[PDB]
Enzyme design. Structure first.
Site, PDB file in Angstrom:
ATOM      1  N   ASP A  32       3.271   0.304  -2.936  1.00 18.23           N
ATOM      2  CA  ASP A  32       3.085  -0.899  -1.592  1.00 18.23           C
ATOM      3  C   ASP A  32       3.387  -1.989  -1.523  1.00 18.23           C
ATOM      4  O   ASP A  32       3.262  -2.808  -2.121  1.00 18.23           O
ATOM      5  CB  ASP A  32       1.446  -0.869  -1.352  1.00 18.23           C
ATOM      6  CG  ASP A  32       1.210  -1.299  -0.457  1.00 18.23           C
ATOM      7  OD1 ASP A  32       1.670  -1.900   0.668  1.00 18.23           O
ATOM      8  OD2 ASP A  32       0.168  -2.023  -0.832  1.00 18.23           O
ATOM      9  N   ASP A 215       6.551  -3.814   4.852  1.00 21.96           N
ATOM     10  CA  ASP A 215       4.943  -2.751   4.691  1.00 21.96           C
ATOM     11  C   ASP A 215       4.991  -1.352   3.838  1.00 21.96           C
ATOM     12  O   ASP A 215       4.781  -0.627   5.173  1.00 21.96           O
ATOM     13  CB  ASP A 215       3.334  -3.893   5.000  1.00 21.96           C
ATOM     14  CG  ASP A 215       2.091  -2.906   4.466  1.00 21.96           C
ATOM     15  OD1 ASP A 215       2.450  -1.897   3.167  1.00 21.96           O
ATOM     16  OD2 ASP A 215       2.143  -3.285   4.829  1.00 21.96           O
TER      17      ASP A 215
HETATM   18  C1  LIG Z   1      -0.754   5.465   3.688  1.00 25.14           C
HETATM   19  C2  LIG Z   1      -1.938   5.070   4.165  1.00 25.14           C
HETATM   20  C3  LIG Z   1      -2.096   4.735   5.804  1.00 25.14           C
HETATM   21  C4  LIG Z   1      -2.369   6.098   6.356  1.00 25.14           C
HETATM   22  C5  LIG Z   1      -1.657   5.706   7.848  1.00 25.14           C
HETATM   23  N1  LIG Z   1      -2.596   4.581   8.263  1.00 25.14           N
HETATM   24  C6  LIG Z   1      -2.595   3.313   7.321  1.00 25.14           C
HETATM   25  C7  LIG Z   1      -2.481   2.087   7.862  1.00 25.14           C
HETATM   26  N2  LIG Z   1      -2.481   2.052   9.614  1.00 25.14           N
HETATM   27  C8  LIG Z   1      -3.619   1.266  10.367  1.00 25.14           C
HETATM   28  C9  LIG Z   1      -3.155   1.008  11.583  1.00 25.14           C
HETATM   29  C10 LIG Z   1      -1.951   1.832  11.968  1.00 25.14           C
HETATM   30  C11 LIG Z   1      -1.592   2.226  10.074  1.00 25.14           C
HETATM   31  O1  LIG Z   1      -0.953   2.323   9.778  1.00 25.14           O
HETATM   32  C12 LIG Z   1      -2.844   1.075   6.885  1.00 25.14           C
HETATM   33  C13 LIG Z   1      -3.182   1.287   5.296  1.00 25.14           C
HETATM   34  C14 LIG Z   1      -3.010   0.030   4.787  1.00 25.14           C
HETATM   35  O2  LIG Z   1      -4.042  -1.137   4.921  1.00 25.14           O
HETATM   36  N3  LIG Z   1      -2.255  -0.410   4.302  1.00 25.14           N
HETATM   37  C15 LIG Z   1      -2.141  -0.866   2.588  1.00 25.14           C
HETATM   38  C16 LIG Z   1      -2.152  -0.172   1.629  1.00 25.14           C
HETATM   39  C17 LIG Z   1      -2.715   1.241   1.350  1.00 25.14           C
HETATM   40  C18 LIG Z   1      -2.577   2.377   0.701  1.00 25.14           C
HETATM   41  C19 LIG Z   1      -3.534   3.295   0.938  1.00 25.14           C
HETATM   42  C20 LIG Z   1      -4.590   3.569   1.546  1.00 25.14           C
HETATM   43  C21 LIG Z   1      -4.775   2.639   1.912  1.00 25.14           C
HETATM   44  C22 LIG Z   1      -4.266   1.067   1.615  1.00 25.14           C
HETATM   45  C23 LIG Z   1      -1.369  -2.023   2.568  1.00 25.14           C
HETATM   46  O3  LIG Z   1      -1.944  -3.005   1.590  1.00 25.14           O
HETATM   47  C24 LIG Z   1      -1.511  -2.821   4.016  1.00 25.14           C
HETATM   48  N4  LIG Z   1      -0.601  -4.623   3.624  1.00 25.14           N
HETATM   49  C25 LIG Z   1      -1.233  -6.032   4.748  1.00 25.14           C
HETATM   50  C26 LIG Z   1      -2.042  -6.534   4.544  1.00 25.14           C
HETATM   51  C27 LIG Z   1      -3.519  -6.075   4.618  1.00 25.14           C
HETATM   52  C28 LIG Z   1      -4.773  -6.497   5.007  1.00 25.14           C
HETATM   53  C29 LIG Z   1      -4.863  -6.951   3.360  1.00 25.14           C
HETATM   54  C30 LIG Z   1      -4.181  -7.594   2.178  1.00 25.14           C
HETATM   55  C31 LIG Z   1      -3.994  -7.657   1.278  1.00 25.14           C
HETATM   56  F1  LIG Z   1      -5.224  -7.743   0.670  1.00 25.14           F
HETATM   57  F2  LIG Z   1      -3.673  -6.831   0.149  1.00 25.14           F
HETATM   58  F3  LIG Z   1      -3.674  -8.645   0.348  1.00 25.14           F
HETATM   59  C32 LIG Z   1      -2.488  -6.600   2.432  1.00 25.14           C
HETATM   60  C33 LIG Z   1      -2.370   2.406   5.133  1.00 25.14           C
HETATM   61  C34 LIG Z   1      -2.425   3.762   6.305  1.00 25.14           C
END
Ligand SMILES: CCc1ccnc2c(N3CCCC3=O)cc(C(=O)N[C@@H](Cc3ccccc3)[C@H](O)CNCc3cccc(C(F)(F)F)c3)cc12
Length: 372
Positions: A32, A215
């Site tokens: 990630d 990301d």
């Molecule tokens: C792979 C799993 C997945 C599938 C499908 N959709 C998904 C999706 N979404 C939601 C709407 C559209 C989209 O693409 C968003 C996320 C998501 O939030 N990814 C996380 C990692 C994660 C991995 C696996 C499971 C949960 C999280 C990443 O850290 C975000 N970066 C900025 C970020 C945001 C907020 C806080 C932080 C911090 F605190 F970590 F810094 C970083 C995973 C999605």
């Protein structure tokens, strides 16, 4: 030996094999670039095939501090500690690193994803509880002679994470670099967006409100609302020979076609222009519909090919997620504070159009496109 060291299920993240503790406990860890905590399931969960057992590791050290991380999707709670970590199909070293042992979670773990933890590869600035919690890659660089960069080729799915360098067998053509504007997320600057060659014609600061990041842990291309609405209007216009329910454009329902008949040609290419390393210069990465229409595997619907629209709205800035990174070789050159893009060996293309990374382009407008 690092090539093809990533696996995954489409839309559910890419993971690399790691071990934690002594003796080594093997876990699959989602890579990630959008966060900075290394965390692993450490208690039973319905969707976990296995988890980190701290009581079995003689090298585990408790830090006596809890930690909570809420992502865009999902959240977890855990206990901070440190332990020995290795990557069997990466550099042959062993690092003592911070680890959040996840003891409670909500909508984080995914049924059937095959991963049990997450590796935040971004900078300490966004680590929880605060920036004194050294991220894994920082520990790796400090404790070994691994060069301060890594590259991702995201392509059941697979790919490669090359730690410490660049593998030329993984891309073709030139590598184009965009500056890392600030070391917290991997923040970059988008200076222009085109849909089938046509400029969205916005003040370029709108593209980066309030930041833009690369990301691998996010699936979609996520766009600020104003940019999202403009993009959808233009994609609708280009594809207007067919009409889809408004719910499709909101990602609330799938679109399906008889197997093998997806009308790729009615959907436009999307070009994202990234700031170059030289004043007023840029390069573009071009995204085909095979990227932003994400296939949803379901045997139940398998008389058809069905897709979800993988461009969605964001209130926290642009996120260039996995559907953007797929088909490109992306170099996270931390040492030189830049991100490189090249066409991947596993690139997207049909017989008419090909994903591309190309430049240079010159802008006459001298406005800084950074939001802050
Ligand atoms: C792979 C799993 C997945 C599938 C499908 N959709 C998904 C999706 N979404 C939601 C709407 C559209 C989209 O693409 C968003 C996320 C998501 O939030 N990814 C996380 C990692 C994660 C991995 C696996 C499971 C949960 C999280 C990443 O850290 C975000 N970066 C900025 C970020 C945001 C907020 C806080 C932080 C911090 F605190 F970590 F810094 C970083 C995973 C999605």
């Amino acid at each position: 030996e690092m090539v093809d060291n990533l696996r995954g299920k489409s839309g559910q993240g890419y993971y690399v094999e790691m071990t934690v503790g002594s003796p080594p406990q093997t876990l699959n860890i989602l890579v990630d670039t959008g966060s900075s905590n290394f965390a692993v399931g450490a208690a039973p969960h319905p969707f976990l095939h296995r988890y980190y057992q701290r009581q079995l590791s003689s090298t585990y050290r408790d830090l006596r501090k809890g930690v909570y991380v809420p992502y865009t999707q999902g959240k977890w709670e855990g206990e901070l500690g440190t332990d020995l970590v290795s990557i069997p199909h990466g550099p042959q070293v062993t690092v003592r690193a911070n680890i959040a042992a996840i003891t409670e979670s909500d909508k984080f773990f995914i049924q059937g994803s095959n991963w049990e933890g997450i590796l935040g590869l971004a900078y300490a600035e966004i680590a929880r509880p605060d920036d004194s919690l050294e991220p894994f890659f920082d520990s790796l660089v400090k404790q070994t002679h691994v060069p301060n960069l890594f590259s991702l080729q995201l392509c059941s799915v697979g790919g490669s994470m090359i730690i410490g360098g660049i593998d030329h067998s993984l891309y073709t053509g030139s590598l184009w670099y965009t500056p890392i504007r600030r070391e917290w997320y991997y923040e970059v600057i988008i200076v222009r967006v085109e849909i089938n060659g046509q400029d969205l014609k916005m003040d370029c600061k709108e593209y980066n409100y309030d930041k833009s990041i690369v990301d691998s842990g996010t699936t979609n291309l996520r766009l600020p609302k104003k940019v999202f609405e403009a993009a959808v209007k233009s994609i609708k216009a280009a594809s207007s020979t067919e009409k889809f329910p408004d719910g499709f454009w909101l990602g609330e329902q799938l679109v399906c076609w008889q197997a093998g008949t997806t009308p790729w040609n009615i959907f436009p290419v999307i070009s994202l222009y990234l700031m170059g390393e030289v004043t007023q210069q840029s390069f573009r990465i071009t995204i085909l519909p095979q990227q932003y229409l994400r296939p949803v595997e379901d045997v139940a619907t398998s008389q058809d090919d069905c897709y979800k629209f993988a461009i969605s709205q964001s209130s926290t800035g642009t996120v260039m997620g996995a559907v953007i990174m797929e088909g490109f070789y992306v170099v996270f050159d931390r040492a030189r504070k830049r991100i490189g893009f090249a066409v991947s060996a596993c690139h997207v293309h049909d017989e008419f159009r090909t994903a591309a990374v190309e430049g240079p382009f010159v802008t006459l407008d001298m406005e800084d496109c950074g939001y802050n």
